[PDB]
């Protein structure tokens, strides 16, 4: 289905601390008020969704059913790929070739170790009576791989009306060609969401502690364009100038007068007799 | 040496000084870089090749060399950009009855390519009759055994060789040198370098709340104001050592 991502998907673009200032960054973000793909689970769904640029994965999960993610473009041992899982109190991010099955499950069934190339171990990313929100921004840039995270309580299904930044949980410089991702979980009433990040220019309001407290998009609506032009949140009454209305070209034209001279190649190639 | 092992090394800082601080590694022939210089240098991947040879065949582990080891067992390319480490080990690698756990390829139809490994034991058909897998006239087993003995000659005494190759090619560096954290001088004006962040000014003690993942601190005009101490997760303000316009 479709839902509304009102104001969600704001991650710290830089490890640079600030205070009480506003910083008009311009990076790959998830635009405000976007129709995001909604799923939920006898009935289920598990396609192979394309990892176009960046996915604001959200999971209003009652009790930690989602079990990792799988990324890549082929996922059949032909191309180097990766697997991220969430063990009871640990996680593993490996980079191997893999061969999967239609219904891998536990009480798994796939080639976990094949032509491997990278491994990772850490604490359980999915910490743990509320359907705790588990936002994760998955993105790759310049041959690096970035993830973000957040863990907030949820009372009782649609995204809340609130703003929460996302710390950079873990970085990992893998740098492989990726196109399509697939989520992983186990059933034996949980929703997983997939947005799509797009190049965009944002305003962010760092608080007195370097923590983000509010954000404004430049390209959303005229008033937001003013806000992003004055570099301020409140806008005093007036008439401001923000940008330049410009029309774009439509098609392509090439011109040249009628051509009359053709090189006499036939007389050489189709000659009746060649010289010695 | 014919079945040389290769240990790929990554996700780690290599203290080269440790092995450089050991006389037994007498033979430390490197080519293309300086050991001391690379201890502040970084690479994407490192490969550690180890094998055992005789006393005098250490020269064969070198670019542009020839011989049984160089042509059939372990060939280095002409454009070698790494180090060679070799030492004598008569105690462990040798035995009183002679060691039979060692083999060197003696016959092969064609010289190896650089860093090629060959573990196939197929009779070297030197003549024109097929061998069918049994040794005989013009049919030789590819490998033979070194008779390492305690009383053997130095040129025949055992020798362990470790070859390090460095390839930082289009890959996020995973191996750098452990440049020791140098001293920190506070309240006296200095020139500083903090994890690739190298300005000039006086270091001081800070009190500004810093989020743990945050590293730097920028003021209005993107000036590096606060810097996380790399070892201890504390914060050092950088306000230029006290100054104020001089008028006479």
């Amino acid at each position, epitope marked *: 289905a479709y839902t509304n991502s009102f104001t969600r998907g704001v991650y710290y673009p830089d490890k640079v601390f600030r205070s009480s200032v506003l910083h008009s960054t311009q990076d790959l973000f998830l635009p405000f008020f976007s129709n995001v793909t909604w799923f939920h689970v006898k009935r289920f769904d598990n396609p192979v969704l394309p990892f176009n640029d960046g996915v604001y994965f959200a999971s209003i999960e009652k009790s930690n059913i989602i079990r990792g993610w799988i990324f890549g473009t082929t996922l059949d041992s032909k191309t180097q790929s990766l697997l991220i899982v969430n063990n009871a109190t640990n996680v593993v991010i490996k980079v191997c070739e893999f061969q999967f099955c239609n219904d891998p499950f536990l009480d798994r069934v796939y*080639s*976990s*170790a094949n032509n491997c190339t990278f491994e990772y171990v850490s604490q359980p990313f999915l910490m743990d009576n509320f359907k705790n929100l588990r936002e994760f921004v998955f993105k790759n840039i310049d041959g690096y791989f970035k993830i973000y995270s957040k863990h907030t309580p949820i009372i009782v299904e649609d995204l809340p009306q609130g703003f929460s930044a996302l710390e950079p949980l873990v970085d990992l410089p893998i740098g492989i060609n990726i196109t399509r991702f697939q989520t992983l979980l186990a059933l034996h009433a949980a929703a997983y969401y997939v947005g799509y990040l797009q190049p965009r220019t944002f305003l962010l309001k760092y608080n007195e502690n370097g923590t983000i407290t509010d954000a404004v998009d430049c390209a959303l609506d005229p008033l937001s364009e003013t806000k992003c032009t004055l570099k301020s949140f409140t806008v005093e009454k007036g008439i401001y100038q923000t940008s330049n209305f410009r029309v774009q070209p439509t098609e392509s034209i090439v011109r040249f007068p009628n051509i009359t001279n053709l090189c006499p190649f036939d007389e050489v190639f189709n000659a009746t007799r060649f010289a010695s | 040496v014919y*079945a040389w*092992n290769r*240990k790929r090394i990554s996700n780690c800082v290599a203290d080269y000084s440790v092995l450089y601080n050991l006389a037994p590694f007498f033979t430390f022939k490197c080519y293309g870089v300086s050991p001391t210089k690379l201890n502040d240098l970084c690479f994407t991947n490192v490969y550690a090749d*180890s094998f055992v040879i005789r006393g005098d065949e250490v020269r064969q582990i070198a670019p542009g060399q020839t011989g049984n080891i160089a042509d059939y067992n372990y060939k280095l390319p002409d454009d070698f950009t790494g180090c060679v480490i070799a030492w004598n080990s008569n105690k462990l690698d040798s035995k009183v009855s002679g060691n*039979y*756990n060692y*083999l060197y390829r003696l016959f092969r139809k064609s010289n190896l390519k650089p860093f090629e490994r060959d*573990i196939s*034991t197929e009779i070297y058909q030197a003549g024109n009759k097929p061998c069918n*897998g*049994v040794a005989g006239f013009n049919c030789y*087993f590819p*490998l033979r055994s070194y008779s390492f003995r305690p009383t053997y000659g130095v040129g025949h005494q055992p020798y362990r060789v470790v070859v390090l190759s460095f390839e930082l090619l289009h890959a996020p560096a995973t191996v750098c040198g452990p440049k020791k954290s140098t001293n920190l001088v506070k309240n006296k004006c200095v020139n500083f370098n903090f994890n690739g962040l190298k300005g000039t000014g006086v270091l001081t003690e800070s009190n500004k709340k810093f989020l743990p993942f945050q590293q730097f601190g920028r003021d209005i005009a993107d000036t590096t104001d606060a810097v996380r101490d790399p070892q201890t997760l504390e914060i050092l303000d950088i306000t230029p050592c006290s100054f104020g316009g001089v008028s006479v």
Partner: antibody, heavy 127, light 111 residues
Framework: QVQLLESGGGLVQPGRSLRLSCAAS????????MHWVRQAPGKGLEWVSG????????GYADSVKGRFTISRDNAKNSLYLHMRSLRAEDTALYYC????????????????????WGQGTTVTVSS | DIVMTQSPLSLPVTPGEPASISCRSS???????????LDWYLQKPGQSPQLLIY???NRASGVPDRFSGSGSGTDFTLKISRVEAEDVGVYYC?????????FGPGTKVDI
């Protein structure tokens, strides 16, 4: 699950060669010392050969020394056992076993603890 | 080049009682670390053998706590605190100090 598959059995005349192959799947190949152990028909076990984590062999049986040749390949997770000078007294099963202690996990490096065993082949010799 | 022996050669055990088997060597297996390198293995008839005890007395993983290993120097003992109907087969002791390794002749336990 950890898997040890061996192949290479078959009737061969005396005075020939063979090459058994053992394939490992389900663990990091370079942190376990592999072993080759025979099993004669209706008799006890008998150690044959072994290999450390760094592809360094650790000697062969006293009565077989001179013909057998072991080799390792961590890239393909493949262990091989070239066999020479085949005689009628070499007919037996052959398991490839694995060590238990991972290297550098605690004095010296471990070589004991043959815990996991694949189903051996049925190499035989006769004329 | 070390030769080991076991005793008794073959002993009948009945389910519900302890049993004791001794493995003896020629050279003491005490290493510089002080650890014994003898290991106990059970090769059930018709099935691939299994590990029972490694490093002298350190219990192997996944086996019940009904087995006990003791001894040092040149004499080691394996005691099954309680025997049942699934404790029949052949037992061996294998050295792990001086290469090449060896396996004892074997004790045959039955009902």
């Amino acid at each position: 699950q950890v898997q040890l598959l061996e192949s290479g059995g078959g009737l061969v005349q005396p005075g020939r060669s063979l090459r058994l192959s053992c394939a490992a799947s389900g663990f990091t190949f370079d942190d376990y010392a592999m072993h080759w152990v025979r099993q004669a028909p209706g008799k006890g076990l008998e150690w044959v050969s072994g290999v450390s984590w760094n592809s360094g062999t650790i000697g062969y049986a006293d009565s077989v020394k001179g013909r057998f040749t072991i080799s390792r390949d961590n890239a393909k997770n493949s262990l091989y056992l070239h066999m020479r000078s085949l005689r009628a007294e070499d007919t037996a099963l052959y398991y490839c076993a694995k060590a238990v202690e991972m290297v550098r996990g605690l004095g010296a490096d471990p070589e004991y603890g043959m815990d996991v065993w694949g189903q051996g082949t049925t190499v035989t010799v006769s004329s | 080049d070390i030769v080991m022996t076991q005793s008794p050669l073959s002993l009948p055990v009945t389910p519900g009682e302890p049993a004791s088997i001794s493995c003896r060597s020629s050279q003491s297996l005490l290493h510089s670390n002080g650890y014994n390198y003898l290991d106990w293995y059970l090769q059930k008839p018709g099935q691939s053998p299994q590990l029972l005890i490694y490093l002298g007395s350190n219990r192997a993983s996944g086996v019940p706590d009904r087995f006990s290993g003791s001894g040092s120097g040149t004499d080691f003992t394996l005691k099954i605190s309680r025997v049942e109907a699934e404790d029949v087969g052949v037992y061996y002791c294998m050295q792990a100090l001086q290469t090449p390794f060896t396996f004892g002749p074997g004790t045959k336990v039955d009902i």
